[PDB]
Ligand binder design. Structure first.
Ligand SMILES: *[C@@H]1O[C@H](CO)[C@@H](O[C@@H]2O[C@H](CO)[C@@H](O[C@@H]3O[C@H](CO[C@H]4O[C@H](CO[C@H]5O[C@H](CO)[C@@H](O)[C@H](O)[C@@H]5O[C@H]5O[C@H](CO)[C@@H](O)[C@H](O)[C@@H]5O)[C@@H](O)[C@H](O[C@H]5O[C@H](CO)[C@@H](O)[C@H](O)[C@@H]5O)[C@@H]4O)[C@@H](O)[C@H](O[C@H]4O[C@H](CO)[C@@H](O)[C@H](O)[C@@H]4O[C@H]4O[C@H](CO)[C@@H](O)[C@H](O)[C@@H]4O)[C@@H]3O)[C@H](O)[C@H]2NC(C)=O)[C@H](O)[C@H]1NC(C)=O
Ligand SMILES: *[C@@H]1O[C@H](CO)[C@@H](O[C@@H]2O[C@H](CO)[C@@H](O[C@@H]3O[C@H](CO[C@H]4O[C@H](CO)[C@@H](O)[C@H](O[C@H]5O[C@H](CO)[C@@H](O)[C@H](O)[C@@H]5O)[C@@H]4O)[C@@H](O)[C@H](O[C@H]4O[C@H](CO)[C@@H](O)[C@H](O)[C@@H]4O)[C@@H]3O)[C@H](O)[C@H]2NC(C)=O)[C@H](O)[C@H]1NC(C)=O
Ligand SMILES: [Cl-]
Ligand SMILES: [Cl-]
Ligand SMILES: [Cl-]
Ligand SMILES: [Cl-]
Ligand SMILES: [Cl-]
Ligand SMILES: [Cl-]
Ligand SMILES: [Cl-]
Ligand SMILES: [Cl-]
Ligand SMILES: [Cl-]
Ligand SMILES: [Cl-]
Lengths: 174, 174
């Protein structure tokens, strides 16, 4: 039984993925056992069966990772602390036959890359961020793409506008 | 007085395009004058303005042309008869500054390609067909893309499943 440091951000993004909120899937490795509760938290429970066996929170749903006009991954931040820093996790969404937690890795100590298989992402346009936006924020994007094509703004100024949109929608915390 | 052979199919597809229904735009060439009434009909009028001047129906809104997971064009069929066949028209939607009927051509006799400029299509992801589908038809599509990657169905069998999806949504006549 663990205490989270902050609460998860609101469920946001593609509508058809919202059904995953409140569900939890787990993967049992030899050393640890991980659980992913999408839009909420990630946790591991060391299965060495010694008395001080570790159980910690790796991250709390905070913001999205948007790269190349798509949802790159889900950012889980502000977990238990390793020392000077709090644990983080980037969940990656991959086409799979069924909702399954497939792998876990540790690129840097206390930073994790979690791969989540689900069939809801098998279509290429499922993780595009443009269809998820409100009718008004699409206009702001439409005007920015045309303005960039008309050479009224720079690729740099265009990049700024997109982050303004994503922040308003709540995909990036700010 | 012109009589359409059938009635135009229901308005279907992206929501932001529905506003064009009941509107009509025209292009005046030297020989003929064309009108496009989106989601309805297409017509040409020889402009000699004599009593026997030609007036014909080129097509009646029937179904979409979906290619590459997007809306390729609008299919207009069952126009006036040329002999063994009824006239057809494929309307193509292009990014333009304003709602404008831009061009008309006749690649093969009694088949026409009509180019309609509109600003509602200027964003690349505006005409994606996946977001317009019901949550269930999205599921049906995801499972079909997954089955194809697992080599349980053929690229040919995949195409048939998609036409079942598009037909169920109402984008294709049946
Ligand atoms: C391809 O697709 C195209 C797109 O869909 C399609 O085009 C559309 O076609 C449809 C079908 O034809 C059109 O819909 C109809 O439009 C008619 C035209 O309306 C306009 O003209 C009317 C003027 O009629 C007269 O009366 C006025 C006052 O009474 C006079 O001021 C006028 O000068 C005019 O007088 C003439 O007629 C008199 C007697 O008729 C005669 O004495 C006089 O001397 C002179 O000859 C206006 O009422 C009308 O105005 C309204 O709409 C405009 C829109 O801009 C507004 O600006 C106005 O403020 C106003 O709101 C237009 O100027 C309509 O008449 C017709 O209406 C009737 O039918 C519907 C359903 O059937 C009824 O619900 C409705 O109440 C009307 O009913 C009348 O007739 C029935 C019997 O017919 C009767 O029982 C009932 O009581 C009533 O009298 C309908 O809306 C549509 O407009 C087209 N749109 C476009 C963009 O083109 C095209 O056809 C397709 N082609 C093919 C080949 O498929
Ligand atoms: C990480 O994130 C995950 C998910 O985001 C968290 O997991 C969830 O934690 C909550 C607690 O905050 C759990 O809810 C409680 O559940 C208990 C027990 O019920 C459950 O287990 C039963 C086992 O058979 C099952 O029958 C229950 O089924 C019912 O409930 C579910 C949904 O709640 C519903 O879908 C079913 O149809 C049934 O209706 C259920 O699975 C329950 O008793 C609690 O309810 C009451 O009591 C508490 C305290 O008295 C009160 O506060 C409540 O408001 C309510 O009145 C409570 O709902 C939830 O089950 C967990 N889900 C999973 C998958 O584990 C996890 O806590 C987070 N951890 C950290 C560290 O952040
Ligand atoms: Cl969506
Ligand atoms: Cl929800
Ligand atoms: Cl892209
Ligand atoms: Cl520690
Ligand atoms: Cl603009
Ligand atoms: Cl936020
Ligand atoms: Cl006319
Ligand atoms: Cl054909
Ligand atoms: Cl394979
Ligand atoms: Cl393919």
């Amino acid at each position: 039984k663990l205490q989270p440091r902050v609460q998860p951000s609101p469920v946001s993004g593609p509508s058809h993925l919202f059904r995953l909120a409140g569900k939890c899937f787990n993967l049992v490795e030899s050393t640890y056992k991980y659980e992913l509760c999408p839009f909420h938290n990630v946790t591991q429970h060391e299965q060495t069966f010694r008395w001080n066996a570790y159980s910690g929170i790796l991250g709390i749903w905070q913001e999205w990772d948007i790269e190349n006009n798509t949802f790159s991954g889900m950012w889980m931040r502000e977990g238990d602390s390793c020392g000077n820093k709090n644990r983080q996790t980037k969940v990656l969404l991959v086409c799979g036959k069924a909702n399954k937690l497939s792998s876990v890795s540790e690129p840097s100590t206390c930073l994790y890359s979690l791969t989540f298989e689900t069939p809801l992402v098998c279509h290429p346009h499922s993780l595009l961020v443009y269809p998820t936006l409100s009718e008004g924020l699409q206009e702001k994007w439409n005007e920015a793409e045309q303005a960039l094509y008309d050479e009224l703004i720079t690729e740099q100024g265009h990049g700024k506008i997109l982050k303004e949109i994503f922040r308003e929608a709540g995909y990036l915390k700010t």
